[PDB]
Write a protein that binds this DNA or RNA. Structure first.
Lengths: 143, 116, 52, 33, 101, 100, 141
RNA sequence: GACCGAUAGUGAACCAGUACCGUGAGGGAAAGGUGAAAAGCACCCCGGAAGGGGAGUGAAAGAGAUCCUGAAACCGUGUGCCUACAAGUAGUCAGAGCCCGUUAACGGGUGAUGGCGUGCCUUUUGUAGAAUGAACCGGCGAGUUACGAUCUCGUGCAAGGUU
RNA sequence: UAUCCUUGGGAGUCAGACUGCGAGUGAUAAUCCGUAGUCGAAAGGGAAACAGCCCAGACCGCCAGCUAAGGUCCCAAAG
RNA sequence: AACAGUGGUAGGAGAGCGUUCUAAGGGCUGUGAAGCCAGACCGGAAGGACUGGUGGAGCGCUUAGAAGUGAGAAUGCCGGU
């Protein structure tokens, strides 16, 4: 600022002014934070809608139980080959399947999501969604 | 963020110091006095697209007035009879571009005294 | 002064500032160029007799 | 998400002062003389 | 063609342009003999440069040291040193380009 | 050689010479023929009674486009007045054959 | 697009006698010939005029009581030293000057205003030594 | 890190609270960049040396020690066109002559000569002013941040809305 | 002939200048009651030059056409 | 499609172009990128694009949210002349 600059008080008006090169900036951005909020009614009526874009273009793909045995990332590349999904994707599983979460984190395109932690963003970016059917019954209960 | 902006000032000051290309003295290098004689040289060039519309008139009249003194008529006497008898709406330019050809002018000059 | 001078009134004040070629002749001894009416620096002789 | 076009008449460019002579309010920034 | 730059020999580059006005169109032997006949303070500096300008050509291009003539003789301002009101000490680039006729 | 006054100031046109007429429609590539011949000349058929009867000039429409970009600047002596505008003026080139 | 001449101008040579005409009445018709107003081709920056020779300048006359009234002033660069003269002495001691002074006022001012004045030739008596150009007589229209 | 990138960010990216200034309390700077590598110029030539020209190194010496890129003011040297009878906010329309060939276009550069033409910004009832301000170039340099009021717009729900 | 009410948002100015017409006045001389116009915020033509006078209102081109005030020997367009 | 209209400071309203940045995509660059210098092109303005030289590591484009602002004037400040 002009005041928190290690500057002089005497006339050389002052050696650390707005026009002076040795001084700081007049205005300038200060320690602030912008955190607004929608209503609760407008926070659960959109997660359906981005889901609703996906039922249109068959971007939803539903699987049963997300069958895994270990943490082999070679299996998931065969699974992405099996479901023929190419770019970024989603995985939603209701019970935090640890073989799923420990796998696929290194595969660059994909991500796994515990079913309560869905949000309006990752449905838009990852643009297709491998869902276990066991998680589908949960998501109507919260919304 | 912070925006320095150095690549946007010189390209805004070349295009003024290019339109001054050919002035006297310092007025094609210093930006501070090349901006005045661009803002004035667009101002004369509007004011003097109206005089060359009106100072080619004093050319064509002065040549017609000399080409009419071959037949005794002045300019006012000639144009007065050029609208009475003849129904032509000939320009004072195109009744002057034919001054070179005496035969042509003469023919049109004969009708002036026909209704005078 | 009252107002600075341009590049035109500056370069016109330097026509009567340049210097001229001094008088150079051909020594009769064994020189190439030397100021007239004087003793050469390299032979060091005058008229027709070296006085050095 | 590629072309997230906002609703028409929902946003408006913030008014500036002293950033143009023809834009308006630049000399005295619309604060009088 | 022969080139001899004297880089940052200490002379003010307006007192050195007053000596390069008679050696830009003269014959090469007829200029070196006129440099020693001048009382100019900064005359010896140019003499050395010229003498080195010939000897660059007649050794490395071998071009008949009584046929040459002086094409370009410019003097450029060089980096200055400022002392203490402030006194500048100017410098000079002197170059001479000699070619055949 | 005819003086034609079609859509603007009358112009002197001899045989075999291109001119520049204002933007009539003219369907560039086709022909056109004016109808307002004044003073077809040579044998001196005067312009008695508003344009010689029966006299036409056939022309071939050749090229349409614009002129050199005249950029009009304008400003007052004070009160922060500034105005700036470019202006390409349209034009039509026609060659000339067979004065009737 | 109109014709504008370019240094291809055949000057004639015209004799004008000032036998009983007036100063400003005869100088008002001469300075249109000098400027080239009477030619059918005429361009205001090319000087398409033509030479005139004036014979018997001392025969001129000016009306009214002007032969005692009109006083010619020629104030030099010296402040407080402005000379003055009349018009009776001017048309008698050297009547050349009176015509070429009053012509000079009616001509324009500038470069062509002093270029055109070089075409004027005013001699005394009634004889011009310019017969190698064969001028003809032109009366005042 | 929707932070800065050497006039910024701390005063300080570098032998900085240093150098300097002051008796003293105290004040308080300036200054980054060869190259992938040091391969940093064996030798020859002029010169007292500096500095050059060759030769070598290297992808580059136009990279040679304040060394990447290197703008502008300022200073130059060549070269096409004008200029030694001419009174001009220097320009602008008309305009030969002369020299040129383009992002091909009613081309480009100079312009003898004619017409018109009281700089710029701020301020005042009002400017040409001697009313104020600028030597020039370059950089930096002045209206929006959560907290409260009020209205417009957009949106959700709506006699129920909201944490 | 197309303007003016309401309500609400947002302001600016608060020493204007000069030239005329209806009552005076002042020295029936240069304030002032009224009212108009222009400039302020308005270029172009005319009055030699001219912020307030005369005519007139600039979207931008064109080497198109007639007029306003004012003008017609020459400078400078036209008897 | 015919009319009507377009001087303008204070001031009010509306429509736009640019400058850095982090990501959803899409795509050039060592056969030469930014930056720099040229140019006789394009758009109603702010401003864009293409060839040519110089440079030796990066940039950019319709699409959305933010902008430590886009300078000719401070008897501005630092540097250079």
């Amino acid at each position: 600022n002009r005041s928190e600059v290690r500057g002089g008080g005497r006339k050389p008006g002052s050696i650390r002014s707005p026009q002076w090169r040795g001084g700081g900036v007049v205005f300038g951005p200060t320690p602030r934070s912008y955190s607004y909020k929608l209503p609760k009614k407008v926070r659960r009526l959109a997660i359906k809608s981005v889901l609703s874009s996906k039922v249109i273009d068959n971007n939803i793909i539903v699987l049963e139980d997300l069958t895994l045995d270990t943490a082999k990332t070679k299996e998931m590349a065969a699974i992405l080959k099996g479901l023929s999904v190419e770019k970024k994707a989603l995985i939603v599983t209701a019970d935090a399947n640890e073989a799923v979460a420990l796998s696929a984190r290194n595969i660059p395109g994909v991500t796994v999501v515990e079913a309560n932690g869905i949000n309006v963003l990752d449905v838009v970016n990852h643009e297709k969604l491998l869902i276990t059917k066991a998680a589908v019954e949960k998501v109507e209960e919260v919304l | 963020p912070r925006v320095k902006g150095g690549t946007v000032t010189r390209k805004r000051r070349k295009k003024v110091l290019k339109l001054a290309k050919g002035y006297f003295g310092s007025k094609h290098t210093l930006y501070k006095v090349a901006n005045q004689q661009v803002m004035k040289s667009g101002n004369y060039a509007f004011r003097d697209r109206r005089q060359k519309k009106r100072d080619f008139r004093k050319l064509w009249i002065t040549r017609i007035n000399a080409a009419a003194r071959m037949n005794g008529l002045s300019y006012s006497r000639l144009m007065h009879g050029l609208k009475l008898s003849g129904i032509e709406v000939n320009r004072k330019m195109l009744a002057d571009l034919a001054v070179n050809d005496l035969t042509a002018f003469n023919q049109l000059a004969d009708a002036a005294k026909a209704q005078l | 002064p009252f107002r600075r001078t341009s590049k035109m009134k500056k370069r016109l004040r330097r026509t009567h500032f340049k210097l001229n070629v001094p008088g150079m002749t051909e020594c009769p001894s064994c020189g190439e160029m030397k100021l007239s009416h004087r003793v050469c620096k390299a032979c060091g002789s005058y008229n027709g007799k070296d006085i050095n | 998400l590629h072309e997230l076009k906002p609703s028409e008449g929902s946003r408006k460019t913030r008014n500036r002062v002293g950033r143009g002579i023809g834009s308006g309010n630049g000399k005295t920034a619309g604060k009088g003389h | 063609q022969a080139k001899a730059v004297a880089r940052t020999v200490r002379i003010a580059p307006r007192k050195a342009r007053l000596v390069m006005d008679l050696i830009r169109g003269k014959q090469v032997g007829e200029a070196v003999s006129i440099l020693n006949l001048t009382p100019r303070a900064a005359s010896p500096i140019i003499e050395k440069v010229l003498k080195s300008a010939i000897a660059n050509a007649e050794h490395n291009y071998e071009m008949d040291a009584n046929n040459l003539v002086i094409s370009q003789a410019f003097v450029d301002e060089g980096p200055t040193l400022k002392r203490f009101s402030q006194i500048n000490k100017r410098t000079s680039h002197i170059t001479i380009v000699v070619s055949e006729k | 050689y005819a003086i034609i006054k079609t859509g603007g100031k009358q112009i002197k046109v001899e045989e075999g010479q291109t001119v520049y007429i204002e933007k009539l429609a003219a369907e560039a590539g086709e022909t056109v023929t004016f109808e307002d011949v004044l003073f077809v000349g040579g044998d001196n058929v005067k312009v008695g009674n508003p344009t010689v009867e029966g006299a036409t000039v056939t022309a071939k429409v050749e090229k349409q486009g614009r002129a050199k970009k005249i950029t009009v600047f304008r400003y007052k002596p004070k009160k922060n007045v500034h105005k700036k505008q470019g202006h390409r003026q349209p034009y039509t080139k026609v060659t000339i054959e067979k004065i009737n | 697009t109109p014709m504008a001449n370019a240094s291809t101008i055949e000057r004639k040579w015209l004799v004008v006698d000032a036998a009983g005409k007036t100063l400003g009445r005869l100088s008002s018709e001469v300075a249109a010939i000098l400027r080239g107003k009477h030619k059918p081709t005429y361009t205001p920056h090319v000087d398409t005029g033509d030479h005139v020779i004036i014979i018997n300048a001392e025969k001129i006359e000016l009306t009214g009581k002007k032969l005692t009234d009109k006083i010619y002033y020629r104030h030099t660069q010296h402040p407080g030293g402005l000379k003055s003269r009349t018009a009776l002495e001017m048309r008698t001691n050297y009547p050349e000057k009176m015509l070429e002074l009053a012509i000079k006022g009616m001509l324009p001012k500038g470069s062509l205003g002093r270029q055109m004045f070089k075409k004027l030739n005013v001699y005394r008596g009634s004889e011009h030594p310019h017969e190698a150009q064969k001028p003809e007589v032109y009366e005042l229209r």
